[PDB]
Structure 1
Amino acid sequence: GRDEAGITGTWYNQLGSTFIVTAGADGALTGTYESAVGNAESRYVLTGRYDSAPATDGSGTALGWTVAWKNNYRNAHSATTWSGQYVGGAQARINTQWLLTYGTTEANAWASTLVGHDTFTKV
């Protein structure tokens, strides 16, 4: 993929969380996520996808991934999805918006979903 090398590695967001990803040639993303906040401890599995043949006109590279917040330590009964774009160069970034959905009863489902935004850097 054009940015396979650029995306693969360890990223950090403004909260202090750590995103560890491998980009495959075909568009896969696999890795681990460790949140600095919330009902979370240690690493969680992630998977996702990215555009392995982006535009050559200076546009970013679209991608996304999911974490279900269950591991051997905790289960928050929740999942987050991040949707965003990789922007390459000396100050590389992944700019995302995310959706965190809790399992709820039907009566509470109106209040099931948090929205926010994370920016990941290599430093």
Structure 2
Amino acid sequence: GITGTWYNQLGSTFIVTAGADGALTGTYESAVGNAESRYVLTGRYDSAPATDGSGTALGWTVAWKNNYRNAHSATTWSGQYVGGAEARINTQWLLTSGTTEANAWKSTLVGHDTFTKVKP
């Protein structure tokens, strides 16, 4: 299932637990950006997905502050878990930095990450 240790295409490590209530909890370690060591993540997933072959919708957030660094920014990943021999979580993400109003136009980066339970 969703619970386990995942890696994206760039080597970031996503350690997550999916609870019966639809909760996601865990830690994220980023291979890119103004980040070091582990950061808390929380999110939600559909705990009763369809039975027609569709994936399981989910999302989570990391605020890029821990006991060692603060980048004044947060990323959300939105996507779906696809089961099978090679389980996969396919996502698109938004990374918003705190900015002044004059700089808000350049506050948000966008991209896509794919996660598997094997390293890239």
Normalised by the size of structure 2, how large is the TM-score? 0.98
1:38-77 Cα deviation digits (max 9, x unpaired): 0000000000000000000000000000000000110000
For residue 13 of structure 1, report the CA deviation from its aligned partner: 0.2
Structure 1 unaligned regions, length at least 5: 1-5
In structure 2, C-alpha distance between the alignment counterparts of 1:100 and 1:37, rounded to whole Å: 12
Give the CA deviation at 1:79: 0.1
CA–CA distance in 1 between the matches of 2:12 and 2:48?
28
**Alpha-carbon distance between aligned partners in 2 of 1:26 and 1:56, rounded to the nearest angstrom:** 19
Structure 2 unpaired stretches of 5+: none
1:85 to 76, 80, 88: 80
Q: Distance in 2 between matches of 1:110 and 1:78?
A: 15
Looking at structure 2, the residues matched to 102 and 50 of structure 1 have their Cα atoms a distance apart, in angstroms, of 25
| Cα distance in 1 for residues equivalent to 2:117 and 2:43 | 19
Q: Give the number of aligned pairs.
A: 118
Alpha-carbon distance between aligned partners in 1 of 2:85 and 2:34, rounded to the nearest angstrom: 34
Structure 1 vs Structure 2 CA RMSD: 0.3
Deviation readout 1:77-114 (Å, 9 max, x if unpaired): 00000000000010100000000000000000000000
What stretches of structure 1 move > 4 A for 4+ residues in a row? none
Identity among equivalent positions (%) equals: 97
Q: TM-score, structure 1 length as denominator? A: 0.95
